[PDB]
Amino acid sequence: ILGLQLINGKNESAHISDAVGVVAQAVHELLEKENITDPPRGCVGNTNI
Amino acid sequence: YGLPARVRDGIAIITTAASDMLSEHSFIPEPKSSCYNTHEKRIYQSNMLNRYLINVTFEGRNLSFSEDGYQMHPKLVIILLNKERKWERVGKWKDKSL
Amino acid sequence: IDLLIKLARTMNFTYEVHLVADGKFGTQERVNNSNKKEWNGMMGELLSG
Amino acid sequence: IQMALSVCEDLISSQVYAILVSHPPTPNDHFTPTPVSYTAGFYRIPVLGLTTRMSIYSDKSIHLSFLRTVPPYSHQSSVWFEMMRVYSWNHIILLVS
Amino acid sequence: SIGIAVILVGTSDEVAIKDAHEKDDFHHLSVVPRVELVAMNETDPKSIITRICDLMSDRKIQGVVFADDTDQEAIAQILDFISAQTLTPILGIHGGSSMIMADKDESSMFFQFGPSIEQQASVMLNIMEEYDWYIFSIVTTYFPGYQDFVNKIRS
Ligand SMILES: *[C@@H]1O[C@H](CO)[C@@H](O)[C@H](O)[C@H]1NC(C)=O
């Protein structure tokens, strides 16, 4: 039975480093932008986006 | 098709399904009346009830339901925008007739 | 059925004949649901194996 | 069922901008991000995936903002194409469920 | 006896709607629908999640009919989620409860009161026939259901 496998595909902790690495420069590019809004206030306070 | 008629017809859809199942199956399931215990009470499945709930009738009508969740013979109207931004009745759909 | 035998003796392959199921030749027709097009008759049995 | 209770009353009230998908103890399970994504996707909140092998979330109709770093099971065909080509194989019998 | 719970959001008269609730001469079959009039501004999912479990815990109900008067484009999707996780059927009647969505889960016993995506394509062309509008062009964007709309046109 011939098959294939992926490297570091089950170790969740390893990919957490890459999860925060990509967002490092993504936030900075968005940080230097105008009309910055805020997330909704609670589940019942806000129903808009 | 007014809202009070929608509720009155909507209620009749549910009543004609579960109550009629008592005529033949004669066993009303009693699910766990709680926010939990959904997985352990899976023995009382609703597949038998789901078998004949699409075919409903209220004092005589054809309200069969599609598996995708749409009515087979709905009632539709056509509207047209006018000068003063008011949609007006134009046509009417009645069982494949215009 | 005489032409078929000539090919059998030249390319040494063995055959067996069987008449068409319905009796037509074959065109493209639309089934009741969607716009799926499938052939019929003698033309449509070659593609079906 | 209790996941929906905690997502709304405890997460979005803390100004959350990105959420990382957890991992089920058993790989056969599927509804690990199902309750979170619906609530998170209600307010157009982007979500990043870490353990997501299901291609259901990538249809672009449902779970529009469901991002992930791990390819699902549906991308294995992109290597089957080349492997049979370099192995000089052209006729393939395809069996699927 | 099986209770029935109905929830509506918007502006209306509560007593007038419930007045005709107890008017069904159902002597043919003892349905006994225990209709409960529940009304609150439950557009947010926070009010829905707590209330839906409270209804069944308080009163054993095996049928729910939902109506609404909101234009929310995602209320049906989250509403189907409750029906997906539960075996109690629920139906959308008015408002955002009956907006068009593509697919349903196998465990989702949810239904809507609205035109079918396929039917509208066939109805719309049925009007073009009556006025001899034999030439047309199609422009569409990305949406859960645009592909199926085109498939009926070419057929
Ligand atoms: C056809 O096949 C036969 C045996 O099946 C063999 O002698 C040869 O491959 C062919 N015969 C010819 C060319 O006469």
From Swiss-Prot, chain A:
NMDA is probably regulated by C-terminal phosphorylation of an isoform of GRIN1 by PKC. Its phosphorylated state is influenced by the formation of the NMDAR-PPP2CB complex and the NMDAR channel activity. Changing residue 41 to Q: Found in a patient with schizophrenia; uncertain significance. Glycans are attached at residues 11, 35. It comes from the Eukaryota. It is found in: Cell membrane; Postsynaptic cell membrane; Postsynaptic density membrane; Synaptic cell membrane. Heterotetramer; the NMDAR subunits are modular and harbor tiered domains that function in concert to regulate opening and closing of the cation-selective ion channel pore. Forms heterotetrameric channels composed of two GluN1/zeta subunits (GRIN1), and two identical GluN2/epsilon subunits (GRIN2A, GRIN2B, GRIN2C or GRIN2D) or GluN3 subunits (GRIN3A or GRIN3B) (in vitro). Can also form heterotetrameric channels that contain at least two GluN1 subunits and at least two different GluN2 subunits (or a combination of one GluN2 and one GluN3 subunits) (in vitro). Component of N-methyl-D-aspartate (NMDA) receptors (NMDARs) that function as heterotetrameric, ligand-gated cation channels with high calcium permeability and voltage-dependent block by Mg(2+). NMDARs participate in synaptic plasticity for learning and memory formation by contributing to the long-term potentiation (LTP). Channel activation requires binding of the neurotransmitter L-glutamate to the GluN2 subunit, glycine or D-serine binding to the GluN1 subunit, plus membrane depolarization to eliminate channel inhibition by Mg(2+). It is linked to Neurodevelopmental disorder with or without hyperkinetic movements and seizures, autosomal dominant: An autosomal dominant neurodevelopmental disorder characterized by severe intellectual disability and developmental delay, absent speech, muscular hypotonia, dyskinesia, and hyperkinetic movements. Cortical blindness, cerebral atrophy, and seizures are present in some patients. Belongs to the glutamate-gated ion channel (TC 1.A.10.1) family. NR1/GRIN1 subfamily. A hydrophobic region that gives rise to the prediction of a transmembrane span does not cross the membrane, but is part of a discontinuously helical region that dips into the membrane and is probably part of the pore and of the selectivity filter. The extracellular N-terminal domain (NTD) is a site of allosteric regulation to modulate overall receptor function. This is Glutamate receptor ionotropic, NMDA 1. It comes from Homo sapiens. The lineage of its organism: Eukaryota, Metazoa, Chordata, Craniata, Vertebrata. The chain holds residues 266 to 314 of 938 of the full protein.
From Swiss-Prot, chain E:
Phosphorylated on tyrosine residues. It is found in: Cell membrane; Postsynaptic cell membrane; Cell projection, Dendrite; Late endosome. Changing residue 17 to N: Found in a patient with schizophrenia; uncertain significance. Glycans are attached at residue 41. Zn(2+) binds at residue 94. Primarily found in the fronto-parieto-temporal cortex and hippocampus pyramidal cells, lower expression in the basal ganglia. The extracellular N-terminal domain (NTD) endows NMDARs with a unique capacity for allosteric modulation, harboring several binding sites for small molecule ligands that act as subunit-specific allosteric modulators of ion channel activity. A hydrophobic region that gives rise to the prediction of a transmembrane span does not cross the membrane, but is part of a discontinuously helical region that dips into the membrane and is probably part of the pore and of the selectivity filter. Heterotetramer. Forms heterotetrameric channels composed of two GluN1/zeta subunits (GRIN1), and two identical GluN2/epsilon subunits (GRIN2A, GRIN2B, GRIN2C or GRIN2D) or GluN3 subunits (GRIN3A or GRIN3B) (in vitro). Can also form heterotetrameric channels that contain at least two GluN1 subunits and at least two different GluN2 subunits (or a combination of one GluN2 and one GluN3 subunits) (in vitro). In vivo, the subunit composition may depend on the expression levels of the different subunits. Found in a complex with GRIN1 and GRIN3B. Found in a complex with GRIN1, GRIN3A and PPP2CB. It is linked to Intellectual developmental disorder, autosomal dominant 6, with or without seizures: A disorder characterized by significantly below average general intellectual functioning associated with impairments in adaptive behavior and manifested during the developmental period. MRD6 additional features may include seizures, hypotonia, abnormal movements, such as dystonia, and autistic features. This is Glutamate receptor ionotropic, NMDA 2B. It comes from Homo sapiens. The gene is GRIN2B.
